[PDB]
Amino acid sequence: TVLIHVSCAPDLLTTIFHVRDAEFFFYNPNIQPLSEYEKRREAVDKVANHFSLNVRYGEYSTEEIRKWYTAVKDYKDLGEGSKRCERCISFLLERTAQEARKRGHESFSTTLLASPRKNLPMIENIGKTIEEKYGVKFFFKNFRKGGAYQEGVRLSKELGIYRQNYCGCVFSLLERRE
Ligand code: SF4
């Protein structure tokens, strides 16, 4: 069994075309503000109910966000795709791999591997670094191949699932406004 970090419902929809016995872990203190976190979480919940997925919801709180910001703040001023995002993704995946140890999963992964905007090599490198540090296997798949991303868009449109237009953190919202 594999514990798969869930970033958002569109990425989840892409991912589940290619996985069948996973437990999903929605953990995203990078998402601000709270109203946006709640909207994305409710979209994930909608997908999970529709397909009977097993999703666990991680902590979201002042303390959790402060830990995340502490981990990414020395690089605030680099764009997206830089070392800021490397630290961000490593924070999320480290918490996922810890949770996988705690729940008896021998493998972990992330729906960010389904995200058209993210750097697949950077994520593989992070997952394998964490695999080394915690001895939980990182399951890599290019979840976007097979045109699976389009399958995710189609199901999103049908199920009426919210599709966000910024990565999640305050930095990415500011870059959205440019
Ligand atoms: S842009 Fe996305 S990956 Fe980069 S720091 Fe913000 S939330 Fe994390």
29 Cα–ligand 1 center, Å? 11
Is residue 53 within 8 Å of residue 21, measured between CB atoms?
Answer: no
* Closest ligand 1 atom to 84 CA: 5
Ligand 1, CB within 6 Å, residue ranges: 30, 72, 80, 84-85, 88-89, 167-169, 171-172
Amino acid at the residue 18: H
> CA angle at residue 100 from 49 to 141, to 5 degrees?
75
Range of the domain at 81: 2-177
Q: Which positions ≥6 away from 39 have C-beta within 8 Å?
A: 162
Buried residues in 31-43 as b, exposed as e (16+ CB within 10 A):
bbeeebbeebbeb
Q: Which two tokens stand for residue 50?
A: 């529709």
Tokens, residue 84: 């800021």
Our count of domains for the chain comes to 1
Residue 26 Cα distances to 19, 59, 79, 81, 154, angstroms: 16, 9, 25, 22, 22
| Cβ contact 168:28 at 8 Å | yes
Helix 9-16 / helix 148-159 crossing angle, nearest 10 deg: 120
Instruction: For residue 32, give the nearest of 1, 69, 4 by alpha carbon.
Output: 69
CATH number of the domain encompassing residue 138: 3.40.50.620
Residue 85, number of CB atoms within 10 A of its CB: 24
Residue 53: how many CB atoms within 10 A of its CB? 17
Ligand 1 pocket test: pick from 5, 80, 94, 170 the residue with the most ligand atoms within 8 Å of its Cβ.
Answer: 80
**Structure determination method:** X-ray
Cα 89 to ligand 1 centroid, rounded to whole Å: 7
Residue 88 alpha carbon, nearest atom of ligand 1: 8
Q: State this model's resolution in angstroms.
A: 1.9
